[PDB]
Amino acid sequence: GAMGMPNRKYADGEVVMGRWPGSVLYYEVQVTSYDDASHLYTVKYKDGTELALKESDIRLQSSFKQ
């Protein structure tokens, strides 16, 4: 059981928390697309700018999920 596993670790269109690559900070992003070969999720930030990050950079919108 991975818990977060609909096909990928995250869904698409879903709003999650994503770490900024060079930082340890997490910002709020929405997943737009996904590279399945190298396992990269393309997400879009509140700033409009979209970025690709690893699944390990993405966490739930809230870690408190019930």
Ordered DSSP codes for 6-59: SSSSS-SS-EEEEE-TTSS-EEEEEEEEEETTTTEEEEEETTS-EEEEEGGGEE
Which amino acid appears at position 21 of this protein? P
Q: How many residues does the chain have?
A: 66
Domains and CATH numbers, the chain: 1-66 (2.30.30.140)
